[PDB]
Amino acid sequence: LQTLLEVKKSLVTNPQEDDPLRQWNSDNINYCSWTGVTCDNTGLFRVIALNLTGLGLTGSISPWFGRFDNLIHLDLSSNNLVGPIPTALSNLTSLESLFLFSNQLTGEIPSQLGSLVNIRSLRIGDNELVGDIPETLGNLVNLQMLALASCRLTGPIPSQLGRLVRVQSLILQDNYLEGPIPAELGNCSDLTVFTAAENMLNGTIPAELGRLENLEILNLANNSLTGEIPSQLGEMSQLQYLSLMANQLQGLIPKSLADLGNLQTLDLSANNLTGEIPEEFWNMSQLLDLVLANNHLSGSLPKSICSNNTNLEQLVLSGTQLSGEIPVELSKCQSLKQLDLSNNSLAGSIPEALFELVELTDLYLHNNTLEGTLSPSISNLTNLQWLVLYHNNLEGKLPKEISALRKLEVLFLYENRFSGEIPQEIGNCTSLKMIDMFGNHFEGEIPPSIGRLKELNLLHLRQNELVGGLPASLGNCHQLNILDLADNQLSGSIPSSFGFLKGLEQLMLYNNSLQGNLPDSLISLRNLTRINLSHNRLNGTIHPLCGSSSYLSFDVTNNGFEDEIPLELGNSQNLDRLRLGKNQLTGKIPWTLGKIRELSLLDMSSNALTGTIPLQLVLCKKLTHIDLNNNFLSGPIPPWLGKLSQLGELKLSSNQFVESLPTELFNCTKLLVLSLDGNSLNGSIPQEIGNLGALNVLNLDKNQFSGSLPQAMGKLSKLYELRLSRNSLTGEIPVEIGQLQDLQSALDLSYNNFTGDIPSTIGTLSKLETLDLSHNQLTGEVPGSVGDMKSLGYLNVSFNNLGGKLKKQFSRWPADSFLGNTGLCGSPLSRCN
Amino acid sequence: DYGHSSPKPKLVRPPFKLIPN
Ligand SMILES: *[C@@H]1O[C@H](CO)[C@@H](O[C@@H]2O[C@H](CO)[C@@H](O)[C@H](O)[C@H]2NC(C)=O)[C@H](O)[C@H]1NC(C)=O
Ligand SMILES: *[C@@H]1O[C@H](CO)[C@@H](O[C@@H]2O[C@H](CO)[C@@H](O)[C@H](O)[C@H]2NC(C)=O)[C@H](O)[C@H]1NC(C)=O
Ligand SMILES: *[C@@H]1O[C@H](CO)[C@@H](O[C@@H]2O[C@H](CO)[C@@H](O)[C@H](O)[C@H]2NC(C)=O)[C@H](O)[C@H]1NC(C)=O
Ligand SMILES: *[C@@H]1O[C@H](CO)[C@@H](O)[C@H](O)[C@H]1NC(C)=O
Ligand SMILES: *[C@@H]1O[C@H](CO)[C@@H](O)[C@H](O)[C@H]1NC(C)=O
Ligand SMILES: *[C@@H]1O[C@H](CO)[C@@H](O)[C@H](O)[C@H]1NC(C)=O
Ligand SMILES: *[C@@H]1O[C@H](CO)[C@@H](O)[C@H](O)[C@H]1NC(C)=O
Ligand SMILES: *[C@@H]1O[C@H](CO)[C@@H](O)[C@H](O)[C@H]1NC(C)=O
Ligand SMILES: *[C@@H]1O[C@H](CO)[C@@H](O)[C@H](O)[C@H]1NC(C)=O
Ligand SMILES: *[C@@H]1O[C@H](CO)[C@@H](O)[C@H](O)[C@H]1NC(C)=O
Ligand SMILES: *[C@@H]1O[C@H](CO)[C@@H](O)[C@H](O)[C@H]1NC(C)=O
Ligand SMILES: *[C@@H]1O[C@H](CO)[C@@H](O)[C@H](O)[C@H]1NC(C)=O
Ligand SMILES: *[C@@H]1O[C@H](CO)[C@@H](O)[C@H](O)[C@H]1NC(C)=O
Ligand SMILES: *[C@@H]1O[C@H](CO)[C@@H](O)[C@H](O)[C@H]1NC(C)=O
Ligand SMILES: *[C@@H]1O[C@H](CO)[C@@H](O)[C@H](O)[C@H]1NC(C)=O
């Protein structure tokens, strides 16, 4: 019977020519010799155990397996098998091991597995099984191990699972099981490891779990249990590991947990626990890991601390709202490797005793209020790899002893008040991968020793007071991703050795005094992502920076860069922000910016660019800001700018643009600043400009506009600055203008050819601070409301053709405000003869 | 694949300051 059955499923477990089970053919007919099979040792033949794991099988499990009434160990683990678990294994009552783990199995766990009461270990996890856990599993009273982890199983933990009196390991983590944890598991009394981590248990932890005298491991992390931690769990005296992290637990931490004499790790981080840390914990000799971070605890470290914590390796109390100073008593925990007190409200100095903790690898004191100095005793922590002190108010020089730390990897001192030189021996800390000292008051040169730090991937010295050159030695730090020396006082040229930083993604050098050409070697930096060289004294061409594609932001504002803008900037499709302002660049704007789909802010102001705006930039639909001021650009304002629906600020002033304003432009309904002053635009102003309802600033000065002023300009209700001076406008000023209630900064109509009366409605301009109508041809008398203007500070109406006795509102405006008007007499001027 | 059944508590690793870009 059974040698038919053995070759039967080799058909279903391998639907293929190639057989890892090659030995299973009727040609070698003694099946006991075959790979993976074991026959009875008693001479009656038949199969007792099958071991097929690590074979790489990709097929299915079949009901013919159930035919073996003498199978005791079935192991199909750690293959890639597919399909359901056959309920036909119902029939193999003789089975004592069932291992299906680490496959790709599907379906629910069969109800009928409950009839295998002589089973001892069941492992079917690391599969994609989908059902609720069947309550029949409680029948398997002989079971010592049950693993259902890392699948897709649902529903409550069956409470009629407490019948499994003799189970030693219960493994349910990494599923979707939900509801309360049953009190009935108190009756599983040889239980020693129990994990239901990474599930959805939503009850409170039953106190009946204190019942389990032999429990050594308890792990319910990453769940959603609520309530207070039962003090009855102090009764679990064989326990070594407790984690309840990442739940929604409430209340004060129970004081009994010190009664767990064998406890090696206690983790209750990431809950809503409160109260103080029970001082009983400081008497827990055998504890290794105490982590209580991110709980709304209260109070401060008592001087009882480390009273009897001889074995403690890791103490984590960050984000626990602790107050007070660091205890000198904490140096009694001489064994301690990792101390984390960050993200608290600690004060005072760092105690000199804490450099007695010579086994420390990690010291976290950041984001407190600590003051004082960093002691040269830091050399004693010779094993330290992460030293993290940022966002404190530490001061003074930085110890030259920091150079004894040959295993140091991370040095975070930023946002303190440190001062003086960086230690010239800093390069002795060869292991260093990240150095951040931003925001201090470090002075003097950057240590050339830093070029010893081959592992260095981050260097950040920004916002200090450092002086002198950029050290060529830094070109030896080949693994640098971010180099940021901005906001200093650095001088000299960039050294051509920086071309050796082939993996560098961010280069920030802005706000310094760097000078001279960029070295041609920077072309090798083809992984660059963000550059900012702004506000320096660099010259030569920017071509060496465009060896990289994949820029996100490229800033060189305010330098002395010369020649043409490289068309290669187009290579960075994802360039969000391009700033070349305040340089000496020449030639036309490059068409290839049209390749930059992601361009949003373009600034080329204050260069010597010539030509026109390339049509291809219509492709940059995300543009919100264009700044081309103070160039030598020519030709019309291109109507395709209206296709930039997102354009909020268009600055084209002090160029040589030369014709009429296109109607298309006013499809840019999101414009807030349109300034085109200082060009040579001609023609009239279009009615459709009122289409710009959001517009805040309109400045058309020092062009040569013509004709009358549109009635639609009263539509710009949000406009606070209006400048149209030094044009040739010809009409009378519209009564519709009084609708611009938000005008504040200026209303400048000077040096035009306006005629008629000044409209009485201008006095309606409640918030306008400056009104200039000088050098026109306006007539009549000034309406007096204009003199009373509540917010007005400057008034000039000189060089018009007005007359009469000035209404008495105009006292203490100066005579200079009414100059050149023959035939005007009044309060500030001469008497009416 | 399977996860550890009682892992040793590991420290968070805190950030370097940056926001300029
Ligand atoms: C814990 O989870 C269960 C299951 O999701 C919730 O039980 C449901 O309760 C509502 C009433 O509030 C019933 O209408 C449903 O039939 C119950 N079952 C299901 C599957 O939804 C229970 O409310 C949850 N408790 C907490 C505190 O969140
Ligand atoms: C310094 O630590 C405090 C407390 O940990 C931080 O403030 C809170 O941080 C948490 C994250 O752990 C946020 O969920 C809260 O919204 C923050 N505010 C409050 C009032 O709790 C703070 O961000 C940290 N600052 C620095 C510079 O690291
Ligand atoms: C201290 O507080 C900060 C801010 O609340 C936490 O910093 C976050 O850390 C993670 C992991 O490095 C990062 O993904 C985040 O970007 C950081 N900032 C924020 C705002 O989340 C930090 O986890 C807390 N704990 C420690 C030990 O530093
Ligand atoms: C099957 O073989 C592996 C080694 O190939 C072994 O670790 C395992 O314990 C064996 N038996 C069972 C029942 O897993
Ligand atoms: C099983 O647990 C219940 C929980 O109330 C308890 O009363 C009972 O004593 C336990 N079974 C045995 C045999 O003790
Ligand atoms: C808890 O959650 C974190 C983050 O999701 C995970 O890395 C960890 O392995 C989970 N389990 C435990 C026991 O910490
Ligand atoms: C510390 O606790 C352990 C617990 O086994 C005990 O043996 C030792 O005597 C205690 N020492 C002090 C000083 O309390
Ligand atoms: C650190 O070592 C020095 C020896 O150079 C010693 O004088 C000092 O006492 C040690 N640490 C403390 C905290 O005293
Ligand atoms: C640092 O490195 C130099 C060069 O090997 C060496 O002379 C010095 O003694 C080292 N240690 C210190 C603490 O300076
Ligand atoms: C550039 O970045 C890519 C992707 O991050 C990486 O695969 C490549 O090795 C990097 N090149 C250098 C020279 O660092
Ligand atoms: C430094 O950067 C600031 C940023 O606001 C800028 O205003 C300034 O012009 C730059 N240069 C100096 C010398 O401060
Ligand atoms: C560029 O800067 C260097 C710095 O010494 C200077 O010698 C050179 O004349 C400058 N060239 C231009 C065109 O400004
Ligand atoms: C100025 O405007 C007129 C019409 O207003 C137009 O015909 C002319 O081409 C424009 N430019 C020059 C340089 O005349
Ligand atoms: C416009 O004003 C100027 C002021 O310089 C004047 O010379 C010119 O004749 C005026 N034009 C008209 C049509 O009044
Ligand atoms: C008004 O403008 C004229 C030039 O048009 C100037 O001479 C006079 O001083 C100005 N008055 C004031 C008060 O600014």
- CA distance linking residue A493 with residue A487, whole number of Å: 16
Residues in chain A: 833
Q: Which are the contacts of A457, defined by CB distance < 8 A and separation ≥ 6?
A: A433, A434, A479, A480, A481, A482
Atom of ligand 5 nearest to the CA of A183: 4
The dihedral sign for the CA sequence A244, A246, A252, A258: positive
Is A75 near ligand 4, meaning CB less than 6 Å away?
A: yes
Instruction: Please give, rounded to a whole number of angstroms, the shortest distance from the CA of A517 to a CA of chain B.
Output: 23
Question: What is the pairing mode between strands A560-564 and A584-587?
Answer: parallel
Contact residues, chain A, for B8 at CB < 8 Å = 265, 289
Rounded distance, CA A248 to CA A271, Å?
Answer: 5
Beta bridge partners of A562: A584
Residue A760: CB partners within 8 Å, gap ≥ 6? A783, A785
The Cα–Cα gap between A510 and A490 comes to 10
Give CA–CA dist A419/A374, Å, rounded.
11
- Determine the Cα–Cα distance for residues A72 and A403; give it in Å rounded to an integer: 64
Is A467 within 8 Å of A490 (Cβ atoms)?
A: yes
Helix, strand or coil, per DSSP, at residue B2: coil
Q: Is A726 helix (H, G, I), strand (E, B) or coil?
A: coil
Ligand 4 nearest-atom number relative to CA A54: 5
Nearest CA among A215, A210, A206 for reference residue A235: A210
Q: What is the atom index within ligand 6 of the atom nearest the CA of A219?
A: 13
Is residue A710 within 8 Å of residue A733, measured between CB atoms? no
Does B18 contact A484 at a Cβ distance shorter than 8 Å?
A: yes
Q: Give the residue carrying structure tokens 């920077």.
A: A522
**A745 close to A766: Cβ distance less than 8 angstroms:** no
Closest CA to A657 of A641, A626, A635, A627: A635
3-state secondary structure of A723: strand
Three-class SS string for A581-600? CCCEEEECCCHHHHHCCCCC
- Helices H, strands E: what count in chain A? 1, 60
Identify the DSSP state of A392.
S
- Residue A512 CB neighbours (<10 A): 23
Q: Are A618 and A595 in contact (CB under 8 A)?
A: no
Ligand 14 atom nearest to CA at A728: 1
Closest of B16, B7, B11, B12 to residue A338, by C-alpha? B11
Q: How far apart are CA A133 and CA A119, in angstroms?
A: 17
Ligand nearest to the CA of A160: 5
CB A238 within 8 A of CB A263: no
Max CA pair span of chain A: 145
**DSSP code of A12?**
H
Q: What angle do CA A168, A173, A178 make, to 5 degrees?
A: 110
Q: Does A291 touch chain B (CB under 8 A)?
A: yes
Resolution stated for this PDB structure, in Å: 3.0
Instruction: Provide the Cα torsion A112, A114, A116, A120; round to 10°.
Output: 140
Residue with tokens 């010291």: A363
Q: Report the candidate in A674, A743, A738 with the shortest Cα–Cα distance to residue A703.
A: A674
A181 class by beta-carbon count within 10 Å (0-12 exposed, 13-18 middle, 19+ buried):
buried
Counting ligand 14 atoms within 8 A of each CB, the residue from A705, A749, A774, A777 with the most, and so the one to mutate, is A777
Q: A416 touching B, CB under 8 A?
A: no
Query: How many domains does chain A divide into?
Result: 1
φ and ψ at A591, to 5 degrees? -65, -30
- SS3 of A73, please? strand
Instruction: Look at ligand 6, atom 14, and give the residue with the nearest C-alpha.
Output: A221
**A436/B contact by beta carbon, under 8 A:** yes
The greatest distance separating any two alpha carbons of chain B, rounded to the nearest whole angstrom, comes to 42
Inter-chain residue contact A362 with B8, CB threshold 8 Å? no
Cα separation, A132 vs A176, in Å, equals: 9
Q: Are the C-beta atoms of A715 and A740 separated by less than 8 Å?
A: no
Residues 645-664 of A with CB under 8 A from B: none
Residues A460, A461, A462: CA angle, nearest 5 degrees: 95
Alpha-carbon distance values, A214 to A146, A261, A606, A796 (Å)? 17, 13, 79, 95
Report the Cα–Cα distance between both ends of chain A, in Å, rounded. Answer: 138
Which residue(s) pair with A123 in the sheet?
A: A99, A147
For residue A738, what are the contacts with CB-CB under 8 A and spacing of at least 6? Answer: A714, A759, A761, A762, A764, A765
In single-letter form, the type of residue at position A210 comes to G
According to DSSP, residue A190 is labeled T
Return the beta strands (E) in A292-360 as ranges: 314-316, 323-325, 338-340, 345-347
Show the beta-strand stretches assigned E in A389-440: 393-397, 410-412, 417-420, 434-436
- Burial class for A43, CB neighbours closer than 10 Å (0-12, 13-18, 19+): exposed
Q: Tell me which chain A residues have a C-beta less than 8 angstroms from the C-beta of B19.
A: none
Amino acid at A759: P
User: To 10 degrees, the CA torsion angle through A682, A687, A692, A698?
Assistant: 40
Taking alpha carbons only, the member of A699, A660, A654 closest to residue A678 is A654
Tell me the two tokens of residue A527.
């992984």
The CB of A582 under 6 Å from ligand 11? The reply is no
Q: Is the CB of A511 under 6 A from ligand 11?
A: yes
Quick one: A514 exposed, middle or buried, by C-beta within 10 A (0-12, 13-18, 19+)? buried
DSSP A513: E
Ligand 7 centroid distance, CA of A257 (Å)? 16
Tell me which residue range forms the domain holding A482.
1-833
Return the residue of B nearest to A128 by Cα: B1
CB neighbours (10 Å) of residue A27? 6
Contact between A569 and A547 under an 8 Å Cβ cutoff? The reply is no
> What experiment produced this structure?
X-ray
**Residue B21 to residue A362, Cβ atoms within 8 A:** no
CB contacts of B2 in chain A (<8 Å) are 101-102, 125-126, 149-150, 174
Contacts of A614 (CB under 8 A, 6+ apart): A588, A589, A590, A591, A593, A594
| H/E stretch holding A540 | strand A537-540
What secondary structure letter does DSSP report for A349? P
3-state helix, strand, coil in chain B (%, to 5): 0, 0, 100
Measured from the Cβ of residue A431, the count of other Cβ atoms closer than 10 Å reads 15
Which distant-in-sequence residues (6+ apart) come within 8 Å of A461 by Cβ? A422, A435, A437, A438, A442, A446, A484, A485, A488
Q: Which of B11, B17, B18 sits opposite A340 (nearest CB)?
A: B11
For chain A, after which residues does the C atom lie more than 2.5 Å from the next written residue's N, i.e. where is it broken?
none
Tokens of A67: 């035919």
